Amino acid sequence: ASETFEFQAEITQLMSLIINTVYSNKEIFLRELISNASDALDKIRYKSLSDPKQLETEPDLFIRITPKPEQKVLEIRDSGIGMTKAELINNLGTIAKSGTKAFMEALSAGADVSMIGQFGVGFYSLFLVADRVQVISKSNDDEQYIWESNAGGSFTVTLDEVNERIGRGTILRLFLKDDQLEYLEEKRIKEVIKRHSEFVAYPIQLVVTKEVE
Amino acid sequence: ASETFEFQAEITQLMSLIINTVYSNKEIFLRELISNASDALDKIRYKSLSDPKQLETEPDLFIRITPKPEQKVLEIRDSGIGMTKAELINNLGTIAKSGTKAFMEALSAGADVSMIGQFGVGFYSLFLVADRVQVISKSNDDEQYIWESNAGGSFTVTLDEVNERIGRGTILRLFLKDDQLEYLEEKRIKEVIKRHSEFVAYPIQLVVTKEVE
Ligand SMILES: Nc1ncnc2c1ncn2[C@@H]1O[C@H](COP(=O)(O)OP(=O)(O)O)[C@@H](O)[C@H]1O
Numbered sequence: 001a002s003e004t005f006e007f008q009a010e011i012t013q014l015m016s017l018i019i020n021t022v023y024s025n026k027e028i029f030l031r032e033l034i035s036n037a038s039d040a041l042d043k044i045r046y047k048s049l050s051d052p053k054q055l056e057t058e059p060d061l062f063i064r065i066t067p068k069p070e071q072k073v074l075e076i077r078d079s080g081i082g083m084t085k086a087e088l089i090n091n092l093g094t095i096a097k098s099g100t101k102a103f104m105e106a107l108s109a110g111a112d113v114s115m116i117g118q119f120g121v122g123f124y125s126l127f128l129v130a131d132r133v134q135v136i137s138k139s140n141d142d143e144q145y146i147w148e149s150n151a152g153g154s155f156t157v158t159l160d161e162v163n164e165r166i167g168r169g170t171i172l173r174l175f176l177k178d179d180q181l182e183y184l185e186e187k188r189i190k191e192v193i194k195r196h197s198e199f200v201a202y203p204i205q206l207v208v209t210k211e212v213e
Numbered sequence: 214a215s216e217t218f219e220f221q222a223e224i225t226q227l228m229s230l231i232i233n234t235v236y237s238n239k240e241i242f243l244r245e246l247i248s249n250a251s252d253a254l255d256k257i258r259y260k261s262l263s264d265p266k267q268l269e270t271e272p273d274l275f276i277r278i279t280p281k282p283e284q285k286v287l288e289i290r291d292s293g294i295g296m297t298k299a300e301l302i303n304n305l306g307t308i309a310k311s312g313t314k315a316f317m318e319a320l321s322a323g324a325d326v327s328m329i330g331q332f333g334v335g336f337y338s339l340f341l342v343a344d345r346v347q348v349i350s351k352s353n354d355d356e357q358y359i360w361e362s363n364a365g366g367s368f369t370v371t372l373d374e375v376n377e378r379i380g381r382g383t384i385l386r387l388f389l390k391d392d393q394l395e396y397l398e399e400k401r402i403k404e405v406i407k408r409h410s411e412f413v414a415y416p417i418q419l420v421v422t423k424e425v426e
Pocket residue numbers: 036037039040078080081082083091092117119120121122123124170
């Protein structure tokens with residue numbers, strides 16, 4: 001069974017603001033999610049310095065992007081530190097985030113939406129191109145769990161019994177808006193990645209499906 | 214919890230014979246599995262002629278090949294008719310198969326292993342390149358189940374609570390032998406496919422993972 005939680009009020013406001021913004025540089029969501037993925041990977045690598053065993057659940061450190069055309073879904077995966085159930089609830093919704101209000105105020109002053117990451121709330125930039133998101137995570141410290149949101153004021157967390165097993169890490173499953181399906185296309189994804197992510201220490205793998213001739 | 218079943222004696226013999234054979238044309242396993250996939254797709258299409266709703270669980274009819282290097286696994290998927298729990302138990306092990314003994318006898322006489330499909334036991338050709346296999350299937354008539362075998366005399370069937378949800382169809386998850394890892398390579402898979410599968414009515418999709426430059 002799923003458990004429902006309430007978002008901290010300001011986060012709900014930020015989400016409403018983002019999913020509705022007519023901003024023109026929506027592609028920035030990928031840079032923010034790849035950046036978060038890279039950070040999660042840095043954390044497991046660092047932790048492993050004094051606890052090498054932590055790497056064994058998934059020895060390969062990578063960031064992987066997988067378009068799922070039929071479902072109009074785009075997945076951004078990492079084999080980073082992952083999030084336990086408590087962390088999902090804590091880190092993605094119930095706790096007040098320092099920059100949330102600050103960023104919204106900056107936005108009102110004329111700040112570029114691209115600044116979202118510098119305010120520490122880059123995760124929510126995903127609502128620029130998706131109206132729904134499932135965060136599937138597996139931390140060495142917990143079972144695999146699914147956190148889900150539709151930018152509304154509440155989210156759910158459910159023990160994962162329906163998705164592929166992740167050795168360790170997180171999958172951001174974005175359910176793209178109908179007018180943002182260009183991010184399912186290989187060429188588009190490739191150019192967005194090359195443009196704002198040249199100094200990423202991990203391999204960024206793009207999964208492409210090609211019909212055999 | 215898993216349920217264990219005994220293989221019909223002759224099937225166990227055939228498996229032992231196949232997994233141990235030093236045969237030189239091992240690549241034929243792909244043609245046999247793609248052929249089985251095509252047959253499963255023919256069946257759902259035919260059934261849909263008088264029961265169109267059966268297609269809604271997965272409107273796209275395809276065959277998809279996905280190499281998983283890290284796990285040394287190769288998956289052959291189809292969105293065909295799928296198999297219920299009873300069918301997995303029945304069709305893949307417990308019931309005597311007409312050609313089983315006939316094929317082994319033909320083999321002893323000097324018959325080419327490639328004839329396996331004409332004897333109706335082409336599925337087991339997978340043991341030419343894999344020492345273990347998981348058959349994940351979802352029939353519109355049942356839940357998603359996992360059938361698993363290591364060519365031993367018994368197999369297990371478990372309600373699926375660990376793999377990605379299949380709308381409808383079957384996934385043959387082959388755990389490749391250490392000396393058969395060439396079938397994880399794109400070029401190799403492509404040539405094997407083009408050679409013995411030109412008259413397949415469905416798109417055969419190859420999933421490739423490429424690091425972004
Ligand atoms: N891919 C991920 N792996 C692990 N944790 C993540 C991931 N993405 C986001 N988080 C967690 O949720 C929090 C919210 O994300 P975000 O707003 O982008 O924060 P920050 O700007 O600090 O990265 C993060 O601080 C982090 O703890």
